[PDB]
Design a protein around this nucleic acid. Structure first.
Lengths: 53, 475
DNA sequence: TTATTAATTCCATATGGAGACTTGGTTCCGACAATATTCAG
DNA sequence: CTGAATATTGTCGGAACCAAGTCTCCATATGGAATTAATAA
């Protein structure tokens, strides 16, 4: 009913394309992924190197 | 992108505390030599020149200069003052003109990445003026040395002090007085000064020799058809100038089959009566066409992932496909195999300006990759017994295929003028015997082959200069 | 009678768009120096 | 009567630019490709 803590963040490509290839394309997650261990991007690089307080 | 990290302090650098990403990307910590603008060049203030209002002078914009530092000045007189060049005269009278002092290296301020650096060599003549958008930077270490040290090398740093500022990329002299030119570059380059100038001069002399005999890719197609059909070159561009075409009601219906009475149609009919006065070879194209397709033009992403797609830029005046795709799609049509070019096809261009419409090309390149042609093409499958497809493409790219498609093609938006199958099938082209053909072709083929052969030599010596400069400045 | 074209609906092509995108460098307002004058008690 | 006024001229800075050049991707009828009920026969 949920994700798995072993991978947590989706840094394994896996079957992300299968969430847009068909049928499951209607149940895709159009939400911004928030990472805390690897970046590969800018948004989750900001959320680690900035110390807002 | 980048995960560049810097430290407040840094933005202290330069008297404008600027902290845009590019500048701070160029700063970096330094341990090597520094120099400044002092022991090198020196900015020169602008001045108003004393123009003589009796002789034709010269002038040079930023677009009149090229990435190779080859100025192409225009010749104004002050006795013409035509409203076409009135803008130039007005900006000259404003005070946007100066004259280089025979030894400076003018640098363009707006968009300095397009190598608009030009050299006013010492021993020369025919003085040419320039726009204040150019920066007189007259050096003290020999013009050639600084010019070659700025063109190829010292370009990642002149381009990293530009002002984006909600518009134009622009270079400022004050910022130009702050670059950190390394000494090893100038030290090594002046160390080899006695021979570097010599061999670079030899290379550019060879380049000048190649350019002296370089001819355009369209005039070759324009002359052979003009030199083979015995038509004078100075009347069809003089008959096309007068615009008072008068027609009657009866002439509207003749060979019309759609009752079209636009002005351009009537002028096309007038020009056809001139291009075929002495030529007796004209046959309707409709009876030599066996099919006609369009293509497939989905949404396309530049430099993306998917099947490549051609554009209108890939059709040249020589009937050879450029087959250099840029756009790439990822859509399907369940019949994609019907539009995958393949060698031997003839592709006329449907949709372009009033002068670049109708340009045909033959796919002479062998490509194992499937490439789609857009809706903006028309594939013609003609009988390969009477027309000789390459000759048809050359004719379409000739003045025969220009003075017709410039005046027959339709549309209310004359910026995307488009042809249709009707104009293709109702086209009275001159078709000489197969003996006469393969002679115009072949001659044109060899002439354009020679022109292309001297098109990589130029961009072989122009690259030899750069690689020699890079090697000498790195040794 | 077994045809029948001349009537239909159903998709792949073809024509057209009060166009739309892209590389590159031009006009021109608007502060602003340098005037640009001082009057003024 | 010394003054640094204001008051303009004329000229650097700068533009949610945008004039030049030229490539497009997509609605929409069509027309033909499927029927049909016709059509003789």
């Amino acid at each position: 009913n949920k994700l798995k803590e072993e991978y947590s963040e989706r840094d394994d490509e896996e079957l992300i394309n299968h969430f847009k290839h068909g049928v499951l394309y209607q149940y895709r997650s159009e939400d911004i992924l928030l990472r805390n261990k690897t970046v590969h991007k800018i948004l989750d690089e900001i959320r680690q190197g900035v110390i807002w307080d | 992108g980048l995960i560049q990290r810097r430290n407040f302090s840094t933005f202290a650098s330069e008297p404008s505390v600027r902290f845009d990403f590019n500048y701070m990307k160029s700063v970096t910590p330094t341990t090597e030599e520094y120099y400044t603008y002092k022991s090198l060049f020196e900015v020169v203030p602008s001045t108003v020149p004393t123009l003589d209002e009796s002789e034709p002078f010269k002038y040079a914009e930023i677009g009149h200069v090229s990435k190779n530092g080859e100025v192409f000045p225009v010749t104004l007189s002050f006795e013409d003052r035509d409203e076409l060049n009135e803008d130039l005269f007005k900006k000259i009278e404003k005070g946007d003109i100066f004259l280089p002092e025979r030894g400076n290296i003018l640098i363009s301020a707006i968009r300095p990445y397009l190598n608009k650096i030009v050299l006013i060599k010492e021993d020369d003549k025919t003085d040419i003026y320039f726009t204040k958008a150019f920066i007189q930077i007259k050096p003290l270490i020999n013009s050639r040395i600084l010019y070659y040290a700025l063109r190829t090398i010292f370009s990642e740093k002149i381009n990293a002090v530009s002002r984006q500022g909600k518009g134009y990329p622009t270079l400022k002299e004050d910022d130009l007085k702050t670059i950190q030119f390394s000494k090893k570059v100038i030290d090594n380059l002046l160390a080899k000064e006695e021979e570097l100038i010599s061999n670079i001069d030899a290379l550019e002399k060879d380049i000048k020799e190649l350019k002296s005999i370089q001819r355009s890719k369209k005039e070759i197609v324009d002359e052979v058809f003009s030199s083979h059909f015995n038509i004078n070159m100075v009347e069809l561009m003089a008959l096309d100038s007068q615009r008072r075409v008068d027609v009657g009601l009866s002439s509207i219906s003749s060979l019309n089959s759609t009752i079209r009475y636009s002005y351009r149609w009537n002028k096309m009919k007038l020009i056809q009566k001139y291009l075929y006065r002495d030529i007796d070879c004209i046959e309707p194209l409709g009876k030599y066409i066996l099919s006609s397709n369009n293509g497939w033009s989905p949404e396309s992403v530049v430099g993306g992932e998917g099947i490549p797609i051609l554009g209108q830029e890939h059709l040249e005046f020589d009937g050879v496909l450029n087959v250099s795709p840029t756009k790439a799609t990822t859509k399907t049509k369940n019949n994609m195999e019907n539009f995958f070019i393949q060698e031997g096809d003839l592709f006329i261009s449907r949709g372009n300006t009033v002068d670049l419409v109708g340009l045909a090309c033959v796919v002479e390149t062998e490509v194992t990759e499937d490439i789609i042609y857009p809706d903006l093409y028309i594939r013609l499958k003609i009988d390969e017994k009477v027309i000789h497809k390459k000759y048809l493409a050359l004719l379409f790219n000739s003045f025969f295929g220009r003075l017709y498609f410039k005046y027959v093609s339709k549309g209310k938006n004359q910026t995307m003028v488009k042809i249709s199958s009707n104009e293709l099938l109702n086209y009275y082209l001159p078709i000489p015997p197969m003996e006469e053909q393969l002679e115009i072709v072949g001659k044109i083929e060899e002439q354009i082959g020679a022109q292309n052969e001297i098109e990589k030599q130029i961009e072989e010596k122009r690259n030899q200069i750069r690689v020699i400069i890079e090697e000498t400045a790195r040794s």
